[PDB]
Amino acid sequence: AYVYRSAFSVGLETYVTMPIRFTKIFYNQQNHYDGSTGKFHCNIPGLYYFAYHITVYMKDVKVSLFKKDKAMLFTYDQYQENNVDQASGSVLLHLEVGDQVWLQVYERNGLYADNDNDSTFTGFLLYHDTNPGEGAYVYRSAFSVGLEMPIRFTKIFYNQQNHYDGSTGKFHCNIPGLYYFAYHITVYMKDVKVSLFKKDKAMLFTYDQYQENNVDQASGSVLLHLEVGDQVWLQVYGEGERNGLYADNDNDSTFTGFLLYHDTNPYVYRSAFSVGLETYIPNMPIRFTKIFYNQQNHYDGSTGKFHCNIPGLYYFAYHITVYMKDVKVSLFKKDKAMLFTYDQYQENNVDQASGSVLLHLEVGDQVWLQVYGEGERNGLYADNDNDSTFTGFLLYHDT
Numbered sequence: 001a002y003v004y005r006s007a008f009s010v011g012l013e014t015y016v017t018m019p020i021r022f023t024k025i026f027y028n029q030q031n032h033y034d035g036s037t038g039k040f041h042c043n044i045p046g047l048y049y050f051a052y053h054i055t056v057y058m059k060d061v062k063v064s065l066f067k068k069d070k071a072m073l074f075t076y077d078q079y080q081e082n083n084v085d086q087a088s089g090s091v092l093l094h095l096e097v098g099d100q101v102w103l104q105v106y107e108r109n110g111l112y113a114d115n116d117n118d119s120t121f122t123g124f125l126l127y128h129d130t131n132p133g134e135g136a137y138v139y140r141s142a143f144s145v146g147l148e149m150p151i152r153f154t155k156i157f158y159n160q161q162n163h164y165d166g167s168t169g170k171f172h173c174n175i176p177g178l179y180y181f182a183y184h185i186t187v188y189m190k191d192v193k194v195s196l197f198k199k200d201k202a203m204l205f206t207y208d209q210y211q212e213n214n215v216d217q218a219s220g221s222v223l224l225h226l227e228v229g230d231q232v233w234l235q236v237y238g239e240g241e242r243n244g245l246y247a248d249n250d251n252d253s254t255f256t257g258f259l260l261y262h263d264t265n266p267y268v269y270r271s272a273f274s275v276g277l278e279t280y281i282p283n284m285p286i287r288f289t290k291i292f293y294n295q296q297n298h299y300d301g302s303t304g305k306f307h308c309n310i311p312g313l314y315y316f317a318y319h320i321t322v323y324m325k326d327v328k329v330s331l332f333k334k335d336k337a338m339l340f341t342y343d344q345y346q347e348n349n350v351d352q353a354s355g356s357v358l359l360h361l362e363v364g365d366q367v368w369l370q371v372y373g374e375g376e377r378n379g380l381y382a383d384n385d386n387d388s389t390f391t392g393f394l395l396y397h398d399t
């Protein structure tokens with residue numbers, strides 16, 4: 001079976017004030033990301049997932065994701081002195097051969113990256129368009145919606161199967177399998193506390209505190225196996241009306257999901273894990289023990305390490321609640337820290353920090369998350385209704 005690959009994952013090496021030219025190449029094997037322009041070129045029509053994560057320092061940041069010269073998605077994060085922030089966004093977009101996609105500052109150019117600080121930008125082909133009707137059928141169930149009881153997202157980035165109901169805010173599973181979900185909320189005016197529901201219960205929680213003159217960005221993502229007829233949605237969670245979700249002409253709060261691996265009987269290549277902290281050790285892997293998904297057992301709870309058992313391209317994402325103390329983590333691959341994520345903590349201001357990257361892995365490769373340096377910046381937080389999560393999945397197996 002031919003595998004359709006087109007993916008890139010890059011980072012800033014310099015912060016600069018125009019398309020943002022990422023020049024740190026995590027992955028770009030098809031060479032479909034052009035480093036001299038910062039633009040991704042579509043060579044294969046289909047449904048593409050894009051995600052970015054920016055270190056906010058010194059000055060506010062506002063960026064927009066462009067698809068062939070139109071602003072599709074906006075992400076705003078205000079900076080306060082002595083308070084480094086983390087802003088992210090993600091969305092599905094269907095692309096035609098020729099479409100180009102990039103990121104630029106919507107000044108608010110507070111993007112930052114140096115020798116131990118990353119701002120990254122990643123995209124991959126999820127579903128290629130199935131010529132009429134050639135080769136491998138593709139199982140599709142996906143949605144990507146934005147804000148304009150379940151939270152009713154009405155702005156439609158993608159809903160081609162209509163498995164998401166815009167009048168109720170609910171996604172309905174029509175195809176049994178492993179689903180990925182992600183959200184990104186701009187926090188303004190009031191605190192934001194949300195919860196990802198599955199059927200009838202809160203699976204995941206994300207809290208982000210709002211201080212005056214400090215718009216924030218909060219995100220979450222998880223892997224959930226679904227059976228036909230059960231649904232998923234995002235609901236404001238708490239008892240203090242933590243509903244400071246925001247959106248306007250050029251500010252988004254989004255909710256995205258997609259079938260990753262469909263269920264089969266006796267071939268699909270599956271290697272995935274999604275785990276969370278159940279509370280809060282220097283120079284050692286952070287051990288996430290709450291298990292959302294770990295079907296192949298490729299993630300080892302007892303060591304906190306992911307082991308590659310199928311060579312190919314992997315996507316990793318994490319989301320961390322920042323409380324009481326600065327948080328800085330490094331993503332390791334095979335005893336080398338690949339990616340760094342820093343988020344300062346200010347009193348009475350819980351924060352949300354995240355990163356995600358594509359990494360090609362071979363047999364023996366281990367991936368894990370570790371607190372940075374001497375392990376001092378360990379303000380990671382989790383409890384009965386606050387999450388810090390680590391997720392990874394096999395995207396394309398080597399052929």
Ligand SMILES: [Ca+2]
Nearest residue numbers: 084085343344
């Ligand atoms: Ca912060």
Ligand SMILES: [Ca+2]
Nearest residue numbers: 078214215216
């Ligand atoms: Ca902020």
Ligand SMILES: [Ca+2]
Nearest residue numbers: 209216350351
């Ligand atoms: Ca906050």
Ligand code: NA
Nearest residue numbers: 086087217352
């Ligand atoms: Na944040």
